[PDB]
Design a protein around this ligand. Structure first.
Ligand SMILES: CC(=O)SCCNC(=O)CCNC(=O)[C@H](O)C(C)(C)COP(=O)(O)OP(=O)(O)OC[C@H]1O[C@@H](n2cnc3c(N)ncnc32)[C@H](O)[C@@H]1OP(=O)(O)O
Ligand SMILES: CC(=O)SCCNC(=O)CCNC(=O)[C@H](O)C(C)(C)COP(=O)(O)OP(=O)(O)OC[C@H]1O[C@@H](n2cnc3c(N)ncnc32)[C@H](O)[C@@H]1OP(=O)(O)O
Ligand SMILES: Nc1ccnc(=O)[nH]1
Ligand SMILES: Nc1ccnc(=O)[nH]1
Ligand SMILES: [Mg+2]
Ligand SMILES: [Mg+2]
Lengths: 266, 266
């Protein structure tokens, strides 16, 4: 059967803005929170209005007094020398570096972020940071503050939206995804020096002109995060519940980020 | 297939804005022309920049002095009574009608229009017509003239963007797609007077408020569009050429609409 037929079959009644709003409150999402969100649309079961419903639901709970952030990574703009998903012929690499269109926050699609993110990032009043590989989008009270001045180097480091979320004592919401999607733990890797440094590259508009721009980042390794997540959960203070069929987690970003930092040093 | 490794192996060298631009000019696309575009991204072969490269290429060739149109249909808003892809239990139908978010031109995503349209839809200075099921988006000189005052009933009829393209002696561009994707033939169906009406439903904003609205339209049938296409290419004028691996067709909209109108009449 098609993906969609299975999704419908595993749903007893439709998910709606209203039932999603209800499930989010039940889990503990509150007006005025700062929350970074990671999601799988399909994991919820069938939704009337798909991604738009999920976005509107989150907004209705958090409100404009709170802030929603999602990662909007665009790794298709990276140096093809290092591509594996899929690799392309070596003879294409320079053509790509010379022709791939420059990052533009209002235009460039995301890769591997999900339909909720694609909806969110083009939604009215949502704002996006200027990083060409590792940007975030945000909506609400601290949206501009969170996304402004993202350093080109160390995209998940002390000068990124993650650090701004940390200073706001924000929350992480995982909807139907595990710890390997939990971007905030990249901040633990930065602070522990857990992973090696790499020269990266991306196309940007600089002084009006298109430049292939190089910089330093960390070779972030998500495979760790599942391990870290299981140990973090034993310590307590991860709230768990369902949004439709989606296994969801809600936690404080400071808590997991501080635990992650110790996990890598010990 | 649609697997990325297969799309890379289908391609000798990458497609770029520059190569796509050149292919479009070779086919007959010109500065200042009015053109409605239908596309498959995968059909072209691997593109550096994907959908962004295709939109930039089109805009480069046509320029602000021309007009680009694309269908931005949103059939996930239709009455679930008739869904087949997939169908949903009858018990969900009234809940769907009570809960599916209303059409909002800056928010409502498209369904089955393709990645090129989803990219295009969100560009700056792109304007979208007002129809919850059969909207269009446009950019350039005639973008407002074409998209304004679309009627709710007979969505592809005499008060639709299709008739405005017809009046402007515009062109239809198919990229790696067939005549079942040729929306303009709907205007033929309306005009023939030969086809049968149906009651349809969708959620709109009326009085600044969400309502499920019912209206009349044609039971547009794209299998007759395909029959019309085969005959038209035997009889009428159509330019064929390639964009990467994509077989493409460029034709005058007035020519196929007039032919189809006769075809439906017999
Ligand atoms: C550690 C790091 O920094 S990594 C970067 C962080 N990453 C993230 O935050 C991403 C988290 N999300 C994930 O990891 C997810 O597993 C994803 C997005 C990669 C894939 O999950 P999916 O549920 O398959 O995809 P997505 O969430 O885009 O939903 C699309 C699917 O929903 C389904 N769907 C479509 N409409 C509906 C609907 N109305 N209701 C329910 N499901 C629907 C379809 O099957 C669709 O699949 P298709 O695009 O193949 O047609
Ligand atoms: C009756 C009426 O009026 S119909 C309304 C009018 N309809 C239309 O205009 C629709 C016309 N288009 C079609 O019919 C097409 O056949 C479609 C859109 C239905 C499907 O075409 P596809 O090429 O499969 O999809 P689309 O154009 O969205 O491109 C996405 C695909 O491009 C491919 N792709 C992704 N990145 C790249 C890249 N850089 N380079 C090349 N291809 C890529 C992937 O295979 C992707 O598939 P996935 O999402 O399954 O991974
Ligand atoms: N093709 C790819 C694009 C981006 N990253 C990869 O690993 N592969
Ligand atoms: N789920 C569906 C949406 C729109 N049309 C269909 O046939 N099916
Ligand atoms: Mg531009
Ligand atoms: Mg817009």
């Amino acid at each position: 059967s098609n993906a969609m037929n299975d999704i419908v079959a595993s749903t007893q009644l439709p998910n709606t803005i209203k039932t999603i709003t209800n499930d989010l409150r039940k889990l503990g999402l509150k007006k005025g929170m700062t929350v970074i969100v990671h999601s799988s649309l399909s994991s919820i079961g069938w939704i009337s209005g798909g991604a738009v419903a999920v976005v509107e639901a989150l907004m209705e709970v958090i409100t404009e007094e709170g802030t929603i952030i999602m990662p909007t990574q665009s790794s298709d703009l990276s140096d093809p020398k290092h591509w594996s998903r899929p690799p392309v012929p070596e003879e294409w690499w320079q053509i790509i570096r010379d022709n791939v269109p420059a990052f533009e926050p209002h235009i460039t699609p995301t890769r591997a972020m999900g339909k909720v993110v694609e909806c969110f990032r083009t939604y009215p009043n949502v704002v996006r940071s200027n990083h060409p590989l590792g940007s975030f989008a945000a909506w609400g009270r601290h949206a501009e503050e969170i996304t402004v001045n993202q350093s080109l180097s160390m995209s998940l480091g002390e000068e990124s939206p993650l650090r701004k979320i940390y200073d706001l004592d924000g929350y992480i919401l995982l909807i139907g995804v595990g710890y390997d999607s939990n971007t905030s733990v990249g901040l633990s890797e930065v602070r522990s020096g857990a992973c090696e440094l790499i020269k990266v590259g991306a196309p940007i508009i600089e002084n009006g002109e298109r430049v292939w721009k190089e910089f330093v980042d960390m070779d972030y390794d998500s495979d760790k995060f599942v391990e870290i997540g299981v140990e973090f959960e034993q310590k307590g203070t991860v709230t768990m519940g369902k949004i439709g069929n989606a296994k969801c987690r809600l936690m404080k970003q400071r808590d997991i980020v501080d635990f992650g930092t110790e996990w890598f040093r010990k």
